[PDB]
Design a protein around this ligand. Structure first.
Ligand SMILES: CCCCCCCCCCCCCCCCCC(=O)OC[C@H](COP(=O)([O-])OCC(O)COP(=O)([O-])OC[C@@H](COC(=O)CCCCCCCCCCCCCCCCC)OC(=O)CCCCCCCCCCCCCCCCC)OC(=O)CCCCCCCCCCCCCCCCC
Ligand SMILES: CCCCCCCCCCCCCCCCCC(=O)OC[C@H](COP(=O)([O-])OCC(O)COP(=O)([O-])OC[C@@H](COC(=O)CCCCCCCCCCCCCCCCC)OC(=O)CCCCCCCCCCCCCCCCC)OC(=O)CCCCCCCCCCCCCCCCC
Ligand SMILES: CCCCCCCCCCCCCCCC(=O)OC[C@H](COP(=O)(O)OCCN)OC(=O)CCCCCCCCCCCCCCC
Ligand SMILES: CCCCCCCCCCCCCCCCCC(=O)OC[C@H](COP(=O)(O)OCCN)OC(=O)CCCCCCCCCCCCC
Ligand SMILES: CCCCCCCCCCCCCC(=O)OC[C@H](COP(=O)(O)OCC[N+](C)(C)C)OC(=O)CCCCCCCCCCCCC
Ligand SMILES: CCCCCCCCCCCCCC(=O)OC[C@H](COP(=O)(O)OCC[N+](C)(C)C)OC(=O)CCCCCCCCCCCCC
Ligand code: HEM
Ligand code: HEM
Ligand SMILES: C[C@@]1(c2ccc(Oc3ccccc3)nc2)OC(=O)N(Nc2ccccc2)C1=O
Ligand SMILES: CCCCCC(=O)OC[C@H](COP(=O)([O-])OCCN)OC(=O)CCCCC
Ligand SMILES: CCCCCC(=O)OC[C@H](COP(=O)([O-])OCCN)OC(=O)CCCCC
Ligand SMILES: CCCCCC(=O)OC[C@H](COP(=O)([O-])OCCN)OC(=O)CCCCC
Ligand SMILES: [Cl-]
Lengths: 105, 49, 49, 48, 61, 377, 49
């Protein structure tokens, strides 16, 4: 399934580098907008993933202050970006939709 | 040496080492409220003096 | 914002439609009264003066 | 139509000279205070 | 002048806030006289013929 | 510690000294304080202009000339007030554009209070331009006030009620002076509620990511950064006042008002040209007046059109291009607004007006959705 | 309010009289400078212009 799949993934990797959050050492889930679903998922993160999220964001804000980026060696590789928050967020959303479905009857 | 010390000696000796000098700060623990270094440095002089 | 489409929410709207209808009469009469709206007040019996 | 012409040009000269002084000095005050942050270094040492 | 110039200015005038303020108010006094004097001399040199005070000699009375 | 406990200084401390602020807010966050500096500049200069101004139609023109000729340094105060108003609109549009780019509109109360501040400053500056009673002053008052005549079934009554007569006249100028005096003080009060709601959350930053992990005190970092920016605001103002005081004005305004003749080349101030261009691209009277109002009131809808799962455009290239297509499109409408209603400017202004609303309503929300799918979420 | 009459309070006043004297010079020079007080400035050497 290489022909058509790799072209789509090729455009996604293009956009990933164009977005440029990897240039500050960040991962995709570090950039999501914090709404109530996201605050709960972050709350549910285990100790290590929470502490890693804190330092990466702190390192990126420090760079943004200095208008700098990391050296190219330290950029977040597209293939190594871990969606550590997505599974927690999916459950938080699934729970809220259950409440909403019960609130309808 | 202690008897030589009076209030003037303390004001002169302390100003020599404290007043408008850059301190070294070390913080450990829940230190979010630890003041910024500039604010600490500004605490080493008095605008009124 | 699809979550407000359900049997409970349409029972809730049905309970509050008599009240909202009446607050429309309050505002309508209040607007006609405060502005001396001749287009409507010519039809009221005793007001005609 | 513009009797203030000559006086305004004299003021304009003084304004440029003072700004040429005050802009780099005030800029220097900003960088002086901010240097604490601009050269700060971070390190992450989590337990393993 | 073996001690640094900036070093002697600090010990004498900038260490205390009171003398740090006195040097500023006294500096603005002498700065105002010299700045206006030099600024006006430059505006007048560019416009040497044009100004009235350059023509007041014609109209003696 | 006494900065924190005094009932009055605690408000000042928690707003300008110990306020936690992001460590990485760029120069685009300087325009908030510059808007307050501008508001304080206009109040001071404006107040000193009211000490030597008369709202009589027969002497309003002459009282302004009396300021610029006989009052000691009255001219410099006068042109600071006029150019300060233009600097006010420079800061407004940058303040707004900052919030659109970086997603600061997600503070709904602060944003919506902001839209109110924009409209009142617009109303204030419009009435201010009517006071000197030049040609553009009078016909500016004629055109803009007549916009209410487009309101069906009550429009002429609202217009004649506002005018105090069957046309703009002495009664209209005297009341516009009273409104222009008081409306800045209401703006200052609304600017405090603007800041009140902001401090509930603190500032956004260029990354759109929460900055609670890295906060710095407002003092001394942003006190000195705001001081530096103010000196640059004074530089921008004094360049106009001291080297080009008529560059942003219209020469016809130096002729007294004449109700019998309208100048042929109507050109508003530069800060209204983009919206003036939107209105005339619609020949229908009511349609063009509604499009004018909606070109500004659409800001209240921007929070509802946010589709991206990221707050700031820093990491959104497709949105960035559409954002700058909106700035260049607004720059086009400003250009078309300053040209007469003739070929090809009529068609260009129509296409730019469609592109303005097309970008905000359709293209930019769709770009944010494409970006989400490209990141697989 | 007699409690401020004592040996410590007169040692404290003696420490702060040099500072308050200097803040009087700041205000005096600042008042003369800001108002262009001709009565005093005619005596200063270079200022005379
Ligand atoms: C305009 C009128 C100015 C009013 C202030 C005048 C000074 C005053 O009230 O005395 C207290 C202030 C206390 O100074 P201090 O000796 O360092 O006392 C430290 C205290 O422990 C207090 O130390 P602290 O750690 O609590 O805070 C130090 C305090 C030191 O600064 C102040 O207390 C000044 C307050 C700001 C005044 C408003 C600006 C003008 O720092 C600030 O609050 C500065 C932040 C201001 C940011 C404003 C921009 C937004 O005394 C002076 O500043 C006296 C000198 C006055 C020089 C004026 C020249 C003429
Ligand atoms: C004359 C009126 C002045 C026009 C202002 C132009 C806007 C601008 O880019 O200013 C950046 C300047 C620096 O802001 P920032 O907080 O460092 O970064 C802002 C964004 O992050 C900036 O985003 P970015 O990180 O992508 O940086 C864009 C790049 C922009 O680079 C450029 O396109 C300008 C390069 C010019 C070459 C200069 C050779 C001479 O900014 C710079 O590298 C800073 C400009 C350096 C100027 C050097 C002039 C010599 O932003 C402002 O202060 C806003 C405009 C200030 C108006 C001043 C007039 C009063
Ligand atoms: C009650 C008082 C209310 C004041 C409210 C003011 C609001 C702030 C407006 C800012 C104006 C900028 C300076 C105008 C200069 C001018 O115009 O001065 C013209 C004079 C020459 O004048 P001269 O040639 O007659 O010779 C004078 C007779 N000896 O030299 C200048 O250019 C000095 C200005 C230097 C360049 C600007 C530096 C800006 C510093 C900001 C300080 C602001 C103080 C704030 C006061 C509230
Ligand atoms: C309303 C009527 C208006 C009429 C007047 C129209 C005239 C417009 C004239 C053009 C003005 C151009 C201003 C200068 C823009 C410079 C842009 C720039 O420097 O680059 C983009 C910059 C990139 O920075 P990031 O934050 O993405 O990442 C930084 C990482 N190093 O990102 C940024 O810095 C973007 C910040 C937001 C810029 C604000 C410009 C808004 C212009 C007005 C908008 C009006 C909306 C109603
Ligand atoms: C387009 C134009 C639209 C205008 C249309 C006209 C609208 C007229 C008002 C209608 C709304 C009346 C509702 C109302 O009365 O409630 C507010 C309070 C509570 O009344 P109360 O009897 O205490 O308890 C109500 C219980 N209930 C309903 C079960 C009987 O009742 C009150 O307190 C109201 C009476 C107090 C008057 C004093 C307050 C006014 C400001 C003071 C002015 C005088 C001093 C300067
Ligand atoms: C009757 C008339 C009386 C008037 C007489 C004139 C008085 C002149 C002022 C004298 C007071 C000066 C005291 C002073 O400088 O302290 C305040 C701060 C701190 O200075 P700093 O160097 O940071 O630390 C002082 C430490 N020391 C004393 C040991 C060296 O220093 C400052 O920050 C002051 C310089 C900052 C200028 C910017 C603030 C002004 C408002 C912004 C205007 C420009 C933008 C619109
Ligand atoms: C008289 C007019 C205004 C004044 C004096 C004013 C002042 C301020 C100040 C001081 C801040 C905080 C500092 C800063 O972000 O620069 C701020 C933030 C903000 N303003 Fe305004 N503003 C005005 C009008 C507006 C308008 C018209 C809008 C939008 C339609 C707006 C939207 C915002 C937003 C969204 C923020 C938060 C920015 C952030 O946290 O990144 N403001 N304003
Ligand atoms: C947000 C605040 C303000 C803005 C944006 C503003 C704007 C303006 C503008 C654009 C003009 C036209 C100037 C001209 O055509 O020459 C003007 C005139 C005037 N303004 Fe304001 N103004 C503000 C506040 C005030 C205040 C608070 C006062 C009085 C207390 C005031 C008093 C005057 C007077 C008397 C004039 C007529 C003199 C003249 O035309 O220069 N203004 N204003
Ligand atoms: C200063 C000015 C003004 C002020 C404020 C103002 O608000 C707005 C700014 C942007 C968007 C919406 C409103 N819009 C015009 O008032 C005035 O009479 N004209 N010129 C004029 C001449 C003929 C017709 C119309 C206007 C102006 O440009
Ligand atoms: C008439 C002037 C009254 C004094 C105001 C003043 O100077 O504020 C204090 C600070 C500097 O003192 P500090 O912050 O080092 O704290 C020292 C405490 N020991 O200065 C600033 O940078 C604040 C900016 C004020 C500009 C209006
Ligand atoms: C929103 C502000 C509305 C103020 C308009 C106004 O001046 O009202 C005058 C008319 C007078 O009634 P009319 O029978 O003369 O009719 C004369 C028609 N010109 O009263 C009305 O028609 C009130 C209409 C209220 C609609 C919101
Ligand atoms: C409190 C507000 C004071 C303002 C008074 C004023 O207008 O000052 C003018 C005089 C001018 O100096 P002079 O030598 O012409 O003397 C002329 C005498 N009329 O300067 C002074 O004398 C300043 C005096 C300050 C005392 C507080
Ligand atoms: Cl005029």
């Amino acid at each position: 399934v290489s022909a058509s799949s790799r072209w789509l993934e090729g455009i996604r990797k293009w956009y990933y580098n164009a977005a440029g959050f990897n240039k500050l050492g960040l991962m995709r889930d570090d950039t999501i907008h914090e709404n109530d679903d996201v605050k709960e998922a972050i709350r549910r993160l285990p100790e290590n993933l929470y502490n890693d999220r804190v330092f990466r964001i702190k390192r990126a804000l420090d760079l943004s202050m200095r208008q700098q980026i990391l050296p190219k060696e330290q950029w977040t590789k597209y293939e190594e970006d871990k969606s550590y928050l997505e599974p927690y967020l999916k459950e938080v959303i699934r729970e809220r939709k259950e409440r909403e479905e019960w609130a309808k009857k | 040496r202690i008897a030589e010390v009076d209030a003037r000696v303390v004001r002169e000796v302390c100003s020599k080492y404290f007043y408008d000098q850059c301190p070294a700060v070390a913080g450990f623990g829940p230190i979010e409220q630890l003041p910024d270094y500039n604010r600490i440095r500004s605490g080493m002089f008095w605008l009124r003096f | 914002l699809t979550r407000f489409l359900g049997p409970r929410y349409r029972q809730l709207a049905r309970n509050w439609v008599p009240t909202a209808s009446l607050w429309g009469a309050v505002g309508a009469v209040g607007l006609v009264w405060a502005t001396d709206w001749r287009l409507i007040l010519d039809w009221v019996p005793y007001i005609n003066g | 139509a513009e009797p203030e012409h000559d006086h305004r040009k004299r003021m304009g000269l003084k304004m440029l000279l003072m700004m040429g002084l005050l802009l780099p000095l005030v800029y220097a005050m900003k960088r002086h205070k901010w240097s604490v942050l601009k050269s700060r270094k971070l390190a992450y040492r989590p337990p393993k | 002048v073996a001690p640094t110039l900036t070093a002697r200015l600090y010990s004498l005038l900038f260490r205390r806030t009171s003398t740090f303020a006195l040097t500023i108010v006294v500096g603005a006094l002498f700065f105002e006289r010299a700045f206006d004097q030099g600024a006006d001399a430059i505006y007048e040199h560019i416009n040497e013929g044009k100004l009235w005070k350059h023509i007041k000699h014609k109209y003696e009375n | 510690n006494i900065r924190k406990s005094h009932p009055l200084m605690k408000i000042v401390n928690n707003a300008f000294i110990d306020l936690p602020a992001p460590s990485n807010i760029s120069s685009w966050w300087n325009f908030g304080s510059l808007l307050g500096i501008c508001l304080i500049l206009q109040i001071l200069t404006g107040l000193f202009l009211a000490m030597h101004y008369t709202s009589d139609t027969t002497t309003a023109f002459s009282s302004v000339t009396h300021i610029c000729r006989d009052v000691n340094y009255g001219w410099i105060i006068r042109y600071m007030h006029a150019n300060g108003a233009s600097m006010f609109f420079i800061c407004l549009y940058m303040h707004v554009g900052r919030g659109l780019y970086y997603g600061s509109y997600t503070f709904l109360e602060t944003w919506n209070i902001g839209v109110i501040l924009l409209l009142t400053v617009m109303a204030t500056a419009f009435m201010g331009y009517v006071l000197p009673w030049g040609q553009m002053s009078f016909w500016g008052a004629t055109v803009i006030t007549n916009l209410l005549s487009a309101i069906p079934y009550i429009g002429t009554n609202l217009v004649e009620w506002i005018w105090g007569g069957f046309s703009v006249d002495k009664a209209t100028l005297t009341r516009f002076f009273a409104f222009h005096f008081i409306l800045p003080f209401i703006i200052m009060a609304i600017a405090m509620v603007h800041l009140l709601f902001l401090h509930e959350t603190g500032s956004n930053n260029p990354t759109g990511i929460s900055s609670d992990v890295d906060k710095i005190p407002f003092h001394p970092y942003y006190t000195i950064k705001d001081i530096l920016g103010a000196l640059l605001l004074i530089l921008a103002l004094m360049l106009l006042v001291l080297f080009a005081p008529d560059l942003l004005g219209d020469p016809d305004n130096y002729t007294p008002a004449n109700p019998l003749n309208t100048p042929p080349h109507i050109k508003p101030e530069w800060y209204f040209l983009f919206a003036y261009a939107i209105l005339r691209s619609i020949p229908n009277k009511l349609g063009g007046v509604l499009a004018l109002a909606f070109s500004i009131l659409i800001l209240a809808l921007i929070p509802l059109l946010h589709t991206s799962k990221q707050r700031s455009m820093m990491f959104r290239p497709l949105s960035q291009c559409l954002f700058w297509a909106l700035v260049a499109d607004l720059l086009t409408l400003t250009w078309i607004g300053g040209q007469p209603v003739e070929h090809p400017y009529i068609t260009i202004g129509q296409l730019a007006s469609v592109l303005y609303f097309l970008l905000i309503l359709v293209l930019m929300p769709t770009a944010g959705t494409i970006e989400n799918k490209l990141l697989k979420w």
